[PDB]
Write a protein that binds this ligand. Sequence first.
Ligand code: A5T
Ligand code: NAG
Length: 334
Amino acid sequence: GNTTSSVILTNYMDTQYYGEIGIGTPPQTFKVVFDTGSSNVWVPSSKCSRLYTACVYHKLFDASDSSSYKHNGTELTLRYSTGTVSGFLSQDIITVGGITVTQMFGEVTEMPALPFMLAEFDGVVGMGFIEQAIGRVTPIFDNIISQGVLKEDVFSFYYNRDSSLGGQIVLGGSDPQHYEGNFHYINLIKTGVWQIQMKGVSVGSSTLLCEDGCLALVDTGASYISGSTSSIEKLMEALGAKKRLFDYVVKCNEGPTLPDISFHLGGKEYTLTSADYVFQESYSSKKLCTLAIHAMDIPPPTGPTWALGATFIRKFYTEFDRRNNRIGFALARH
Ligand SMILES: O=C(C1=C(c2ccc(CCCOc3c(F)ccc(F)c3Cl)cc2)C[C@@H]2CNC[C@H]1N2)N(Cc1cccc(Cl)c1Cl)C1CC1
Ligand SMILES: *[C@@H]1O[C@H](CO)[C@@H](O)[C@H](O)[C@H]1NC(C)=O
């Protein structure tokens, strides 16, 4: 076909980038993250007890209001860090920027209060492959490819810096108005996951880490750049940053003078300056500034691995190419 479909995103504090979908007849609207590190659609269920704080603060999907709903009822579980997210399968019609698709999705009935009660959005649309789909549920972008309608079997992300357009996802192409120059591509290690080879991470001009190669998951649903606990220790030693309980910090006045960090991917070094990875909430020496880089031990089969989240995606406009199993990067225009 010759169609593209774009969806406007909202940027909450540089950590959450979400957009609207509609599910059912008539449409029930939900704010969702479009997430390349997962393959399932999830929204909260009207069957979620009001003694879940994550449910109280969010919109709930009610099947008993949708005429196009089709029962399934198979139980689904995700074992997240803080606890289990579980629910059940349902099918309904889902709209995403003017494309309409009959989709199997999970209705959440329980989940931990953290971090989910802090989410400004209601759900998740996984943009990953059937290989990592819980219950092998056909993922949404698979069902869009099968309709024949997109101009190219690609989708792309634009994430803005905080302030205005917060971001944009385009289905079926890219939007030239939001990047400059041309894309540079890297082949997936294997289909199934949006993960590429990384050949080195540099602090300054010398290659600090990932000497004999490693893995980079390109995860639009991650807030930060993450590496293993042991790689992040070494990066933060090199940056002179201090370990807090859930983050790393530097004295705020040291912020602007921190080294460039570079990621070696395909045939380019992708560079972040301190302006790209420091949360400069002050310039004072009496205050501490958080870094947009965090340790996460990602469990097999996909990990151990780095994750390039929104920290990375903000600077580099990203295209996810299903046709050719590759990821393209271009420098974002802000
Ligand atoms: O941690 C994840 C990720 C993933 C994820 C996907 C689905 C789920 C299941 C349930 C989420 O549904 C939500 C929700 F995310 C938020 C609020 C809700 F009410 C619901 Cl039902 C949990 C985590 C998949 C993938 C690999 N791990 C890191 C990341 N990307 N999150 C949670 C998250 C990330 C960043 C900030 C916040 Cl506040 C949250 Cl809660 C979801 C947004 C993408
Ligand atoms: C739910 O859908 C799945 C497809 O993954 C199917 O295998 C299963 O039988 C369905 N449940 C029922 C019994 O309707």
